[PDB]
Design a protein around this ligand. Sequence first.
Ligand SMILES: *C(=O)CCCC[C@@H]1SC[C@@H]2NC(=O)N[C@@H]21
Lengths: 222, 213
Amino acid sequence: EVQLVESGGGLVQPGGSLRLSCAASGFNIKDTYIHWVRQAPGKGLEWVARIYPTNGYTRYADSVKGRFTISADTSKNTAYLQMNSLRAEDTAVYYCSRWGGDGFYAMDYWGQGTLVTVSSASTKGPSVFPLAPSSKSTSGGTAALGCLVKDYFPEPVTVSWNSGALTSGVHTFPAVLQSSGLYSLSSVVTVPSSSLGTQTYICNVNHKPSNTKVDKKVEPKS
Amino acid sequence: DIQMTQSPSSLSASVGDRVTITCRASQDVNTAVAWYQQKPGKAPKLLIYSASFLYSGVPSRFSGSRSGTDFTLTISSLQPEDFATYYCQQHYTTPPTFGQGTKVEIKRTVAAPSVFIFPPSDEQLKSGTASVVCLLNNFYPREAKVQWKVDNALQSGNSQESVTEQDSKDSTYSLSSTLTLSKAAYEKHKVYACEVTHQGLSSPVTKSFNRGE
Ligand SMILES: *C(=O)CCCC[C@@H]1SC[C@@H]2NC(=O)N[C@@H]21
C-alpha cells in the first residue's frame, strides 16, 4: 500500500532554516507529482509547493517563493522541503501528498504531517497539579477528578490515566495559550464516588519537546 | 488564482439527515475539483474526485455533483463519525486552491451538563499562583454560559475556556473554565463559585466552595 511519511519538524527560531523530508513507499515518485500542503493551527489548508521528480520542475505558492525550495531524490524515493527565513507565519503542520498521476490530479495519499513551530520562546516542561475530587461527591453516585497541566511550551503534551487502564469517561481538553505565552490544559475523568479513597487515580503526563514525564497521583484532600 | 468560495462555514444536522455543502469556483474549472474530509488531529482524506466520483473506501452516503461553476458535496444520511471539517479544492490551475472549509457537527437531543468545581491544590499555591477549575461534563448543545463569582463579585478578564471535540459515542461536549488568580488574591477571598447556564437546565446551576473548608 502507498504511504507517505514526513519527518524533520520541530521548534525553530524565527529567521532560521529547517529541512522536511517525505519518504514514499508502495510507489515510485518518478511517476507522480509530490506536494507540500500546510495547515496553521486552527486554520484551513494551504498548498505550499510541488515537484515533478523526473525532471525536477517545481512550482511554489507566492507566500513561500524564494524562501523555500522543494526537491526530490528519486534514488531515495524521498522529497524534501528546505525552509529558510522562517517566520512565525510559517508555524503549521506540514503535510506531504501526491497527485495520483495518469490523468488523476486529486491528492489521494497524504502523510500524517509534521509540526513546525517558529518561535523565539524556549522549551519548558509543565507542572502537574491535582484536581482533587470534592468531599461533597454524592455517595454512591459519580465524582470527577483530574490533573491540571500548566505552563509548558511548545505543543504537544499527552495525558493518560492509570497507564491506559482508565479510558472511559476521560476528557483531555485542548490546550489554551495563556497570556504568559505558555500553554495549559486539564484532563478530567468521572468515576464512581464509591471508588474514592480506595482506587488509585494517576495521570501520566508526557511532554516530549522538553523530555518531561510526570505521573501525578490524584486523591481526596485530607 | 482561481478562488473556491465554500458555504456554509458550519452546520449542524441530526443523524440520518441530508447535508449539503456547496462551493463556487470563481471561474470555470471544468470538473477538476476534489472534496476532502479532515477529522481532528488527522490528515485530510480524499472523498470525491473529478467532481462526482466516489474515492476508495468512502461510504456510499457521500456523493458529489457539478453544475457549471457550482460544486456540491452531499451526505445523504449523516452519521456520528461524519463529524469533521470538509474542504473543496480546485486543481484546474496552479496554485490548487482550497475552500475555507465547512465544520459539520451532529445535532442530538438536549443534555444538561454535570458541573464540578475544583479548588487550587496546596502544591500550586506554594508557587504563587492559584487556578480554580469548573468542569461541565457531557452536554449538548455546545453553547453554554459559565460565570465566575468570587465572594459574589463577577469576574472578568481572568478566565479561559476549552471545549472537547464532539464525542463519538454520545455526540456530547465537555467544557472547562479556568480562573487564574495570584496566591495573595486567592487567600484574601472566601467563596468561589461557578454559575452555569444551559438549555438543559431549568435554572442556572452554581457549584461553589469556601477556601479552607
Ligand atoms: C477583599 O477583597 C474583600 C474580601 C471579602 C471576604 C468576604 S467578606 C464576607 C465573607 N466572609 C468571609 O470570611 N470572607 C467573605
